[PDB]
Design a binder for these strands. Structure first.
Ligand code: DCP
Ligand code: NA
Ligand code: NA
Ligand code: ZN
Ligand code: ZN
Ligand code: ZN
Length: 327
DNA sequence: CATTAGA
DNA sequence: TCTAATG
């Protein structure tokens, strides 16, 4: 957790690099399992040779570990770190819509900067266009102060559209959190469930609503069950206009809501742990449902769920209030 | 690990 | 269709 800290971080930086800058999935993959095991390795590593003994750790990684221990640094690491090429890639990827692939490509075109990015909006697609158009706000955190107004607004319109709807703003916001990155709204209607062959409009209605009253500014993407947009609190009585924010709206079939809700509320730690327990308790949890375990190694049979509570009950747990879903 | 764009 | 991107 800190006893092998440096080692693990160098290794991540290392891994990271193969994957984006170059394209060595392998190596990249190589670095992570290694950094994965050494992290667990409950003993302060004094040498490579020692590390080496680990699984995933081969000749190469050890070597690095040696120099890293020996001298407070790593050359290949210092070099990369400097190297404009790699730097440029890491950077471009910052724009919503820019992945490594494209990052790589732009660079080899000579698009190392945001300015360049501008001068070539032609080479960008819409996602990426919008991305650049809000690069700054994109990086900005969401003061919960803001999260509450936003939430407020969403709920009202949903409501007006159809009172049958069921929305939930999940995430960290849901778990107390002082800020959040983007808003995730969980969505399901009663007329939509596991069987009933879709209802696209079910989603499309509100997407339009919200958009109708200027909360929705732009559309990153829009499916029949998932919508990726850009919203924004109305700039009051002028002077303090609000930063553009990432929002994702999702249609879930009524019968698998709370699992989804449970799920989305996280935290990963509550998850895995909420997950580790359901197993002992004779089950299985997932992003959508919860099925009883059967001794033949496994089983199915998606249990009926009416609320976050139900699941707890199921795995006979203690209802943990969202605020305390922190682990 | 799933859903949407895109070319 | 595949391949990229966000989640
Ligand atoms: C997993 C964690 C959440 O359940 C969901 C993804 O949500 P985000 O990636 O938005 O993560 P958080 O809500 O935890 O972070 P943020 O502070 O960005 O909202 O899947
Ligand atoms: Na990006
Ligand atoms: Na392939
Ligand atoms: Zn020891
Ligand atoms: Zn989020
Ligand atoms: Zn999100």
């Amino acid at each position: 957790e800190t006893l092998n800290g440096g080692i693990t971080d160098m290794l991540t930086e290392l891994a990271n690099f193969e994957k984006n800058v170059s394209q060595a999935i392998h190596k990249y993959n190589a670095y992570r399992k290694a950094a994965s095991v050494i992290a667990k390795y409950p003993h302060k590593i004094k040498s490579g040779a020692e590390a080496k003994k680990l699984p995933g750790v081969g000749t190469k990684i050890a070597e690095k570990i040696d120099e890293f221990l020996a001298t407070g640094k790593l050359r290949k690491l210092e070099k990369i770190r400097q190297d404009d090429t790699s730097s440029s890639i890491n950077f471009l990827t910052r724009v919503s819509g820019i992945g490594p692939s494209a990052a790589r490509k732009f660079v080899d075109e000579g698009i190392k900067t945001l300015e360049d990015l501008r001068k070539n909006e032609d080479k960008l697609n819409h996602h990426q266009r919008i991305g650049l158009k809000y690069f700054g706000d994109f990086e900005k955190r969401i003061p919960r102060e803001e999260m509450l107004q936003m939430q407020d607004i969403v709920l009202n319109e949903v409501k007006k559209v159809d009172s049958e709807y069921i929305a939930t703003v999940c995430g960290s916001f849901r778990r107390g959190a002082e800020s959040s990155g983007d808003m995730d709204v969980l969505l399901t209607h009663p007329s939509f469930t596991s069987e009933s062959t879709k209802q696209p409009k079910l989603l499309h209605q509100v997407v339009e609503q919200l958009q109708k009253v200027h909360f929705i500014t732009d559309t990153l993407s829009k499916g029949e069950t998932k919508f990726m947009g850009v919203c924004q609190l109305p700039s009051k009585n002028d002077e303090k206009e609000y930063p553009h924010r990432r929002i994702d709206i999702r249609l879930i079939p009524k019968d698998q809501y709370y699992c989804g809700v449970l799920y989305f509320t996280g935290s990963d730690i509550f998850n895995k742990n909420m997950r580790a327990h359901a197993l002992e308790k004779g089950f299985t949890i997932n992003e959508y449902t919860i099925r009883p375990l059967g001794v033949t190694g496994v089983a199915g049979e998606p249990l009926p769920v009416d609320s976050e509570k139900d699941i707890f009950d199921y795995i006979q747990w203690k209802y943990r209030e969202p605020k305390d879903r922190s682990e």
